Amino acid sequence: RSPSPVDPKRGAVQPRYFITTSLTEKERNSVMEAIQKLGQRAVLVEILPLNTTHIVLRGPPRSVKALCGVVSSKWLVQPSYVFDSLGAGFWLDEEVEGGLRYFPPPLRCQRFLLTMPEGVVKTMLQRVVEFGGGEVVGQDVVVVSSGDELLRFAISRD
């Protein structure tokens, strides 16, 4: 988060399709109202809607939707990205605002060995791996014992 206070860097003038994840109802409604107020080709719109480009979340990626965004090259931005852009009068540059985007998709065509017992956590991680174009092994493998390990792998590629 480092825009210039004089001439803050403008983001590209193009459609932005926002969803939110794991926000409180109050913060979600505030984010929605700000997106609608700023406009300028942004819209608040499967695990992710097929038209998703941006995911608003508070804090680091933790939910299934946030992890699917990490591995499918969506922008992951804090609520401040929306409120700061409304304050500037235009959509700010996502990277200057501290937004996260991992390109190309970091799990694509990679094989993952989930060294954990069966359960909802394993199931969710298999869904994330597949959402990112990877394969879960049922040798060139990435061993994962936690979602944190998969996340740290996904953000450290290229």
Residue numbers in the entry: 474 to 518, 524 to 616, 626 to 645
The authors write:
We previously identified KKT4 as a microtubule-binding kinetochore protein in T. brucei (throughout this manuscript we refer to KKT4 from Trypanosoma brucei unless stated otherwise) (Llauro et al., 2018). KKT4 directly binds to microtubules and maintains load-bearing attachments to both growing and shortening microtubule tips in vitro.
To understand the function of the KKT4 BRCT domain, we solved its structure using X-ray crystallography. KKT4463–645 yielded crystals that diffracted to a resolution of 1.6 Å. The structure of KKT4463–645 revealed tandem BRCT domains. The N-terminal full domain (BRCT1) consists of a central four-stranded β sheet flanked by two α helices on one side of the sheet and one α helix on the opposite side. The smaller domain (BRCT2) consists of two α helices and three β strands, missing a β strand and an α helix in the C terminus. No electron density was observed for residues 463–473, 519–523, and 617–625, suggesting that these regions are flexible. Superposition of KKT4 BRCT1 with the N-terminal BRCT domain of H. sapiens BRCA1 showed a good structural match with an RMSD of 1.11 Å (for 65 Cα), suggesting that the KKT4 BRCT domain may bind phosphopeptides. The sulfate ion is coordinated by three residues in the pocket, T494, S495, and K543, which correspond to the key residues known to interact with phosphopeptides in other BRCT domains (e.g., S1655, G1656, and K1702 in human BRCA1) (Williams et al., 2004).
